[PDB]
Amino acid sequence: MKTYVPKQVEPRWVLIDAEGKTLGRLATKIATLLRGKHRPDWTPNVAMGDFVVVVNADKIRVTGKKLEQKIYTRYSGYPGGLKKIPLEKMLATHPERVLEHAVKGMLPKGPLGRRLFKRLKVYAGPDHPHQAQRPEKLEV
Amino acid sequence: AKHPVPKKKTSKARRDARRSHHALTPPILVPCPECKAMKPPHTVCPECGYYAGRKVLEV
């Protein structure tokens, strides 16, 4: 007998409120949901995770003095092209990218990890446009 | 100059990918409005000697 490999099923849409939650502790759960590791038919070679919509990402919280101390970095390939941006400037300029980076750093590397990251939709503020998909509110 | 030299024999894949732009394009021909023979545009028809609707050259 071989192990059951599922047929390509319909993925479910899920909505999460980020407000007041801890950045990393919510990020790990978002990533697990993207993996499909909450489903008993999970398989590592296919994309079968949920579609995770997130609102109020601009109101994420974080412990300690990480407002002025966490430093995201970008090396543009040129000499001296090392950008250092703090968490405060990030929250005030591209706030959803905070959650985006925190999740992207927790998904596997390779192609499948990239499309899994494409299955996540982060939105600053309380409003999202995926009303057509009718997401399921989750209390994570 | 210290005589640069190929480091490794090029794989058939790589040489043919380099040659991927070597395909000839076929000529550009139109019918001559007298003998209906295929000829390059803006040239005098080499099959009837006509251009712009008159004889110019003995064919």
């Binding site: - | 070597h22 000839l24 076929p26 000529p27 390059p40």
Partner: protein, 112 residues
């Protein structure tokens, strides 16, 4: 029915004549005729001779209509090489390979 023609030991480089052969494969006989006629290459002459010999084979030997002929197959093979000595500087002797081609053209009838 098919009708083939081969020009063996054509003194020219295969990689050079294949460039012109690739221009007429799958084309109708008249299309290939004009195409070879106004192709600015050396191998155009030889591909033209082989195509005409094939069409003559078709008509005069295999009961095929001239107005139904097209280039069903067309491939160049490489033949023996004429290795020549080329004197270089400082007394070194190179070997130039003067290559040769086997042109093959196969025609058929385009019914309809």
């Amino acid at each position: 029915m098919e009708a083939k023609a081969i020009a063996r030991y054509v003194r020219i480089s295969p990689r050079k004549v294949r460039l012109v052969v690739d221009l007429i494969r799958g084309k109708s006989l008249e299309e290939a005729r004009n195409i070879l006629r106004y192709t600015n290459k050396r191998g155009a002459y030889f591909v033209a001779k082989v195509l005409e010999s094939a069409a003559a084979n078709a008509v005069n030997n295999h009961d095929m209509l001239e107005d139904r002929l097209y280039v069903k197959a067309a491939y160049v093979d490489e033949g023996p090489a004429l290795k020549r000595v080329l004197p270089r500087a400082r007394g070194r002797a190179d070997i130039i390979k003067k290559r040769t081609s086997h042109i093959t053209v196969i025609l058929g009838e385009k019914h309809g």
